[PDB]
Amino acid sequence: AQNPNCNIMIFHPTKEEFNDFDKYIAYMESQGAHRAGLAKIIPPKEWKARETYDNISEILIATPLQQVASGRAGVFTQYHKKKKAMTVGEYRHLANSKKYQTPPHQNFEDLERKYWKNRIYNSPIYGADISGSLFDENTKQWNLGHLGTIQDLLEKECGVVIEGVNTPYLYFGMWKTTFAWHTEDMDLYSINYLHLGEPKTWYVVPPEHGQRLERLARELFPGSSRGCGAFLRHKVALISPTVLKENGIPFNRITQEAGEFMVTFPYGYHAGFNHGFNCAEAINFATPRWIDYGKMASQCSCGEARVTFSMDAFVRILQPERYDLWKRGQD
Numbered sequence: 192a193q194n195p196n197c198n199i200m201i202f203h204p205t206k207e208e209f210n211d212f213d214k215y216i217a218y219m220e221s222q223g224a225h226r227a228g229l230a231k232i233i234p235p236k237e238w239k240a241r242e243t244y245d246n247i248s249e250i251l252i253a254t255p256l257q258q259v260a261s262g263r264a265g266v267f268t269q270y271h272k273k274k275k276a277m278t279v280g281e282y283r284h285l286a287n288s289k290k291y292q293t294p295p296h297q298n299f300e301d302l303e304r305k306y307w308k309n310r311i312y313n314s315p316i317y318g319a320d321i322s323g324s325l326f327d328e329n330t331k332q333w334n335l336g337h338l339g340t341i342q343d344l345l346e347k348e349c350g351v352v353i354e355g356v357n358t359p360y361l362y363f364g365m366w367k368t369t370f371a372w373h374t375e376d377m378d379l380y381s382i383n384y385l386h387l388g389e390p391k392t393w394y395v396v397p398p399e400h401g402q403r404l405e406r407l408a409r410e411l412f413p414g415s416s417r418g419c420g421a422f423l424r425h426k427v428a429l430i431s432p433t434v435l436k437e438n439g440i441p442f443n444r445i446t447q448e449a450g451e452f453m454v455t456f457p458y459g460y461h462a463g464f465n466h467g468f469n470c471a472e473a474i475n476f477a478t479p480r481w482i483d484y485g486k487m488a489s490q491c492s493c494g495e496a497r498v499t500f501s502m503d504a505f506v507r508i509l510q511p512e513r514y515d516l517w518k519r520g521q522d
């Protein structure tokens with residue numbers, strides 16, 4: 192068995208190996224990368240996502256989200272308070288202000304320590320989940336707006352044609368902006384490219400151990416657990432590495448820097464935070480190996496998780512028993 196300790200693997204494809212996206216994902220899995228839940232891909236030195244980022248300031252963040260925490264430093268939830276629209280230029284200036292900027296620090300470990308110590312005492316503003324792309328149309332390799340769609344993968348593997356579309360999303364971050372512990376919708380893959388700015392630290396639980404994280408989360412968030420049998424689908428709960436270690440939960444961590452891709456694998460729980468002003472682009476995707484994960488994915492039917500148009504068809508075809516109840520949640 193490849194990668195039996197489930198370590199995060201880092202790949203350095205050549206420009207020739209960067210041509211065929213599907214084939215490279217399958218290669219990484221042949222080496223055991225999926226066992227970690229997360230892999231890093233450093234693009235060949237010849238590649239670029241676009242020529243410059245000098246002209247992005249007028250992108251609108253229609254609904255910036257202020258991430259307000261509750262709980263204790265290592266075990267907390269966050270809720271998202273909607274703020275007034277602002278441009279990316281306005282948001283960058285806000286991120287760099289004395290109230291929101293990254294503190295002085297020695298290295299990524301010191302910054303990580305400071306994040307876990309102090310996150311709950313601040314409410315950073317995240318420009319998350321913005322439909323769009325920063326890849327140049329002429330970038331032919333690993334262009335997250337030109338990937339094969341999940342609906343086409345389902346149709347190729349299973350023969351059924353379904354409605355829905357699959358487009359990327361932009362994330363503009365600042366110091367302390369946080370992504371809560373989650374797997375993807377329908378336990379899909381995700382791919383995330385850090386276009387510019389300061390790093391993003393990731394934490395990940397191996398897919399084979401995901402239920403250990405779920406059992407800890409039920410213990411730590413006991414009212415949420417009674418409310419919903421899949422409350423991590425709400426994407427609000429945070430648990431620190433110190434707490435995970437105290438409870439014996441297997442996990443790994445890695446920091447992504449600008450110019451790097453991360454891939455999350457089916458049922459790989461992940462969480463993390465931004466170091467300072469940055470912009471990432473991410474999208475879900477599927478492979479043949481995903482189909483069985485999609486059939487088994489948990490679902491929120493309490494109504495809180497409220498998700499995309501395209502997830503309807505995935506539930507309807509892969510999980511027809513659940514369909515009915517899940518759709519009562521979504522209506």
Ligand SMILES: O=C(O)CNC(=O)C(=O)O
Nearest residue numbers: 362370381382383471473
């Ligand atoms: O970058 C973020 O805030 C969150 N991203 C992801 O969870 C992902 O790419 O799967």
Ligand SMILES: [Mg+2]
Nearest residue numbers: 247248249250
């Ligand atoms: Mg612009």
Ligand code: NI
Nearest residue numbers: 374375381455
């Ligand atoms: Ni994710």
Ligand SMILES: [Zn+2]
Nearest residue numbers: 419491493495
């Ligand atoms: Zn729910």
